[PDB]
């Protein structure tokens, strides 16, 4: 009936502290299409996040890319927070630069 989102959090370019980059949260494999996605910096919602236009894969599941500019540092923590009808509570996935 419904499909829960897969979530990947990652950078557009290899991460280098102090160098501007893009933080991506890719949500995929989900159904139906309504979904809530925030990018977090140290646990706070980043304001002006953009996303791709709704599309879907051959199995009908939807996917979206959310992204924002960011400059990674050693201390700052980034994450993606996702809510969907299939989730009893929002799921938070931390950015791990090795993933």
């Amino acid at each position: 009936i419904q499909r829960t989102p897969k979530i990947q959090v990652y950078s557009r370019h290899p991460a280098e502290n102090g160098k501007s980059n893009f933080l991506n949260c890719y949500v995929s494999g989900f159904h139906p299409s309504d979904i809530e996605v925030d990018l977090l910096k140290n646990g706070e919602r980043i304001e002006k996040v953009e996303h791709s236009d709704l599309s879907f894969s051959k199995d009908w599941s939807f996917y979206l890319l959310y992204y924002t500019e960011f400059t990674p540092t050693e201390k700052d923590e980034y994450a993606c927070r996702v809510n969907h009808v299939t989730l009893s509570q929002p799921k938070i996935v931390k950015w791990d630069r090795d993933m």
């Binding site: 890719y26 159904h31 009908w60």
Partner: protein, 276 residues
Amino acid sequence: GSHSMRYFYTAMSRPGRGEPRFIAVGYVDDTQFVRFDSDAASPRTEPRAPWIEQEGPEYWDRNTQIFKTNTQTYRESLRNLRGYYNQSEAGSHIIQRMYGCDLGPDGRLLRGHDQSAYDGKDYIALNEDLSSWTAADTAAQITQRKWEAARVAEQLRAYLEGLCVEWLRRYLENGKETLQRADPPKTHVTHHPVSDHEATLRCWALGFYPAEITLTWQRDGEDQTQDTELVETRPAGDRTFQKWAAVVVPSGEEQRYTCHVQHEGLPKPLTLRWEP
């Protein structure tokens, strides 16, 4: 190479929250080139790739007319399907449609597609003969009967063999510097101890286009399908894609593992190992 054009329509009802939303996006291979969203402040077909911008006002007006009409038609279709499944007016439902044409590496039509789903389940699909339908259930049989009566397949066949291919070839030429350029993956292997007797080897592919790629790990020349963690290919946001494949191996056995990479952008498939 081989190329395809696809339009993806999503029509979603939302009782209590206005009329059903209709979105359409158009792709050539893995590159989106147009969108239309009935929820936009001023709904119109908008370019999403530089190479489509040169199309004239008549193109944009015609696209927008089609999508505006579709917005209304899909609202009727959503009502129809609710009725076909005896569903209440309370729930939100979705029709999805994906259709388009595939060309082989010589620009000839390989096959056409026109498939629909309701609430994420196969509903009705035009068969590869572009003449007959496969309906998933008795509800879709009603649609099938309607479409057979309205000569729908005949009209889609004309489109799929005609304008679909003509336009796709036009786009491929206009955007040849990108659409007909395959960018190979930049590859490397990383090593991460997970304990005293095991370590993770992760094979990376970055910056590739198109998205199709194969990343595998072998141990002693044998594929390690069951033991490999393979993430979904993901968009980087600059047109390219990324993927990795990981395997957990006994410490000291790292050199027995090889990562193999195949990508259209690679004349020679790659074989990599961890390089400490």
